[PDB]
Symmetry: C3
Subunit: 509 residues, 3 copies
């Protein structure tokens, strides 16, 4: 084989790629490394959320649970919940046929509560010479009973005196008060229970006042012909509520002191509750990631990645070290091994390949590569850590008569999602183009530094390599790599070689 | 004229550009081609929406149409609509003075419905020994009548027995049920129509119960001193609804079975309905386009481009091939004709211009240009195709009473629009700079490849051109354009010429 | 001092850099200038908003002011307001214990109104043989009185004939009408005041009708045991409204003609109202800026910069002229002085440094620098002026029972904010990288132009400098700087010097 000048080549050092990304301008570009921006893994279970357990309502509806249906678990010792899990077809709802007023609003505020305590508002004896109505519809502990939170006031010895009770909110926190009205199926039943004709209930704070008369007639709830209407008010501290009645009142007994509420979600039963903890709960499973996007499920709650309508987004970190880079004047070598291995983030090195009479081949340039690792790390950390906003679902709880606002809320959630989706896709494509170009610019700069050191002592082959015009042993090569090579040392030799080469003829002259 | 070396130039080949773009850093840059990102053309009419016709309500208001004002067209054979077109001053509203409860919600739910069927709920005979009220206010072509969907129950032989009727939703779908209450102007009229003292109506499902008494007094509607209140409920499959009255009930006769509703819009009359079809209806006209932005009208429905507050957005595809590029070391030639014509997307070529003793001299480099074409194609398709979310208006139907929520909804639509508008403008400016610089980079790389091929056989004149230091005929030039030129072949000749040129002096030494 | 060639260097001329920015890939990069994109300065006061003063409600609540509590300032002379400032603990509310129906919505429509005129709807005389009730609860300068806007109709000589009154909106404008119902604590008081048994009030337009009976019982408002309910309706032009009562009506007297409403905000008292004018009012103070972002306060109103969750965002405008640019082959000179001083936007010049026998050595290149200034100016103006949307807070006024919708509105505001916050942070980082790189490319292009002019008459030292191979006095230097230098003029001399330099041996042959 013909004799050739010693050579040094500046460019990429890595293994085979096996990892593609897309850029704005090209698909399936092999790169030495990338990271995934989109989380696709989840627990497939309901978990505790940042250390706070949800409440699974089991076989009860929210209304049944909050009003104290005795078929439902008592909330006497509950202190908090991060969210609720409910069976849309729970058999235990209101045990006596009736309805809860403004119940969508109620569901929204109780979707999560960070601090919750049940409290006795008014003791039963306060109402005076009255008896407590119980019913087989609301059995508890083997006997006819009633909702835990309410007292059904009925006559004693065929008399119903005007009953009065009041509660002052001195808790320093908000207090949910529940009360109700029983509406008899017949005037006969109204007279029997309440004695007084046209009985009334008056409920007032300092800010509002409501009066309630009986609405008599037959209803179609299971097991009873009469009906109950349940009402509620959230008292701010300092508020005062009064109750007066001559028949029909379902008196408040227990209520709820709350702080930091409306913080959760009502998820649907089916997916199973597990002993696990995550920072983001979705209807599909819990998510524990530091990624800032997820494509798993739009219905999400907590410290969440933003839901996007997308597949995986691979963000380029490493090199575009492919066979065709020589077409753009660049050099790259593929190796399976290098002393110390490849650096983690970029996989791995800017560096040199040399060839002289003592052999080949490669060595990394640590300084430039470290500069590059610093740049890519800074870019990644900016793209990720600046997403420090609130990215869970834009969402509320609504009842069945609240279709329009429910649709609007869901549409806004979807539109915000469309914005983040497009932006994330385009950002990844654009930045991949930029990252790969930046690596190129970096090795080109290194190449120009070497060019500048060698000056007239080398021929620029235009492919990332220099043919050195003098013998350059491993020690000389090392002076080139560590930036101590002085071209003056080899000027004479190099000029002679240059002259020699100028005279050579492929076809003899 | 003095003798000159043969020469080859590398750069842009195009015709004179006529259209301009803006970039983030420069105004009115002439380029060889661009595409428009914003649709400005529409039909100026109301059209079918993705194959589904709207309903023009003509001389009727929505309330008149839905309750069955006998002066409005019957919806007996209606099966679907994509949207509604309504005259705000339609003469045919509620024919008998009255009001529809929660009618903004009703309008929202019925703004579009993809499956619709009128259905008889309760047969009139079910109400028993009663008669049906008719009135000159709601005439059927000259005959006193009433709303098609309701029955005005009145006394028969001066008796009104308790009436009762019920409907079970067995349809497997949602059913809209309408009923009403007639409130007499006087006690005399109450007694005359309904006979019974203190007439009541009771309507209940298993979920809720409402009781209605008469509210007696003179109203100011046209043609009547009394008043009607109309109520509705949307029944889910399996619900059941019951009605009882001793006077006042406007009994349900027809209801509507509906599927996939709340999908439309109530547009205003004026713009004409035409035989045409479109992916996206606006209040100005229909849009058929593959562009992903429009600046025509914010009130838009369907498979729509995103509305933006912007003029046209021209996305550069072609070259910046202008006289001043020489200042940046770039070469360009302007020709009215080539051969095979110019490429459609970029209009048109990276290539060569040559000059030798045989003549001159233009030819395209197909590989590099096609690479650029694939690049631009990929960019455009990325920008456009990734906008695959939902971009019609964020909007609802609201009545006069719900101004606050109407305003908030409109503001959120406007904020989403502001985000898209700013992002679109900036994306186009930035990407235009990038595209133009990309073409430049591509022809520079071409130039460097030729420079590498020629080596010491040519002088780089820093303007995209190489002066060749040897005779280079058309065969030679073609070896240069096709990558087969071997510099060794001409070494002896080029070194002679170089000596020669090196010895020339403008002013004799 | 060995002999050295004359030299010219092309690159940056500036003073020492006192200012740093961050880029997407690097923190704390010193640049010669930047601008702030985020406003952080404000007045700390409530100001006029675009020429329109707010109203400070002082000692009164909105409700007490709007219904005309005689303890509050009369609005008889008010013509407009941009926003309201209210004390949540304002002592003057409803002077006679009661409530305003739908007061969240009313607050929202009256948050700001651009044209306002109180108007007398119906004279007191119209209600007939009635008297006007007064109370010590609502005093006017010690005199028992009542709300300005209403008349408390009570018996005259123990008769209360049916009272009637009407108002036709013929103003071409929207008209707010207020009315109320007084609800006695006892039947005794009802009979005393109103005489008639079961008194009723009927209020109707052609669009709706409401009937009101008395709700008797004790309430807990200060200083009275009875209760008042206040209602309102905003009449559109052409509307008509009627009032009839046999007892209980608080009859409308004064209403409000309004145009362009719902435009303001109800801010909280505390921050002082000052004599100043701004185009954007926040709860913290007024903002007067051309910046398009603010990080002061999310509760903002008017022609506002967009609130973002961010620190300051510094946009690079100037040069990266640091000691280390030589590593990338770039030249830079630090000077405190230059004739003409440094240009404002970039601080300041692309230029030349020269060295010859006469001395040294700096001069600006005006053409290239002015080109750069035009580029940066154009970029900044695009980034700023394209942000011409509506960026004040997305919010509404809501009462205490409207928690869910309030929370949802606030969450949408927050999500829009999160979008702009991220986008602004990333835009600045990316564009800073691009700006610094653009300055570099500009000076490299100048460098290449000079290189092209010098041809073989200079050695490119790789550091932005050329060692000129012939003597090059100030005149010659100036021909290099103004582009008239002809390399042919110096060919002989240059070749001789090159040969000399070639033959020299730092280390002897
Ligand atoms: C709720 O708070 C109110 C206000 O403090 C209490 O009413 C007062 O009770 C005190 C003590 O008997 C009386 O001296 C005052 O005259 C009352 N003020 C008024 C205006 O009623 C009330 O007792 C508290 N209720 C409960 C159940 O604790
Ligand atoms: C509506 O559905 C109910 C079912 O709940 C029907 O009422 C039942 O009628 C059947 C005979 O048809 C009786 O055996 C059941 O005891 C009834 N159930 C209850 C709980 O009342 C009712 O007949 C249906 N009405 C219509 C209009 O079809
Ligand atoms: C409000 O408008 C109505 C309708 O125009 C007025 O009623 C008319 O008034 C004239 C003068 O008395 C009568 O001749 C008409 O017969 C009335 N028309 C009807 C249908 O009632 C009414 O007077 C106006 N009221 C006020 C206070 O301006
Ligand atoms: C660089 O290389 C030479 C030969 O390996 C070595 O002797 C010298 O100390 C090195 N210089 C520096 C500063 O690394
Ligand atoms: C390139 O040009 C030469 C001379 O015209 C021709 O003979 C040769 O076949 C060409 N080579 C290729 C690869 O097209
Ligand atoms: C450039 O510089 C030379 C020397 O000062 C001067 O004579 C000449 O007029 C200048 N040319 C132009 C075009 O400004």
């Amino acid at each position: 084989a013909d004799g050739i000048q010693d050579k040094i080549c500046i460019g990429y050092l890595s293994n085979n790629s096996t990892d593609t990304v897309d850029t704005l301008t090209e698909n399936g570009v092999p790169v030495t490394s990338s990271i995934d921006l989109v989380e696709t893994n989840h627990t497939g279970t309901y978990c505790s959320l940042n250390g706070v357990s949800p409440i699974h309502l089991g076989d009860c509806s929210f209304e049944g649970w909050i009003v104290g249906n005795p078929s439902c678990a008592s909330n006497i010792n509950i202190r908090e919940w991060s969210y609720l899990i409910e069976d849309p077809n729970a058999p235990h709802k209101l045990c006596f046929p009736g309805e809860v007023d403004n119940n969508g609003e109620l569901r929204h505020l109780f979707s999560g509560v960070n601090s919750f305590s049940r409290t006795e508002l008014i003791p039963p004896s306060k109402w005076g010479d009255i008896l407590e109505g119980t019913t087989a519809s609301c059995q508890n502990r083997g006997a006819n009973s009633f909702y835990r939170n309410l007292i059904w006031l009925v006559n004693k010895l065929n008399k119903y005196p005007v009953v009065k009770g009041e509660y002052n909110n001195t808790t320093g926190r908000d207090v949910l008060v529940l009360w109700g009205i029983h509406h008899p199926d017949t005037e006969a039943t109204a007279n029997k229970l309440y004695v007084n004709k046209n009985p009334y209930t008056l409920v007032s704070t300092k800010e509002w006042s409501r009066r309630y008369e009986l609405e008599i007639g037959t209803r179609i709830g299971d097991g009873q012909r009469s009906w109950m209407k349940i009402y509620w008010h959230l008292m701010h501290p300092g508020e005062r509520i009064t109750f007066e009645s001559s028949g029909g009142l379902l008196a408040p007994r227990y209520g709820y002191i709350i702080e930091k509420y409306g913080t959760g979600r009502i998820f649907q039963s089916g997916v199973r509750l597990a002993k696990c903890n995550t920072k983001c709960q979705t209807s599909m499973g819990g998510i524990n990631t530091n990624k800032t996007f997820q494509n798993i499920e739009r219905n999400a709650l907590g410290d969440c990645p933003k839901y996007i309508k997308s597949g995986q987004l691979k963000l380029a970190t490493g090199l575009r070290n492919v066979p065709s880079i020589g077409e753009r004047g660049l050099f790259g070598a593929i190796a399976g091994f290098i002393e110390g291995g490849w650096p983690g983030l970029i996989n791995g090195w800017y560096g040199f390949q040399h060839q002289n009479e003592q052999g080949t081949g490669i060595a990394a340039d640590k300084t430039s590569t470290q500069k590059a690792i610093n740049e890519i790390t800074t870019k990644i950390n900016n793209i990720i850590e600046k997403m420090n906003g609130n990215y869970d679902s834009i969402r509320g709880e609504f009842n069945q008569v609240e279709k329009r606002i429910n649709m609007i809320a869901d549409r806004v959630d979807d539109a915000v999602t469309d914005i983040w989706s497009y932006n994330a896709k385009l950002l990844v494509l654009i930045e991949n183009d930029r990252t790969l170009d930046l690596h190129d610019a970096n090795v080109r700069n290194l190449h120009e530094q070497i060019k500048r050191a060698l000056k007239d002592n080398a021929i620029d082959e235009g492919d990332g390599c220099f043919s050195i015009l003098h013998k350059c042993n491993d020690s000389c090569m090392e002076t080139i790599r560590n930036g101590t090579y002085n071209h003056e040392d080899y000027k004479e030799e190099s000029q002679l070689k240059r002259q020699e080469i100028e005279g050579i003829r492929l076809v003899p002259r």
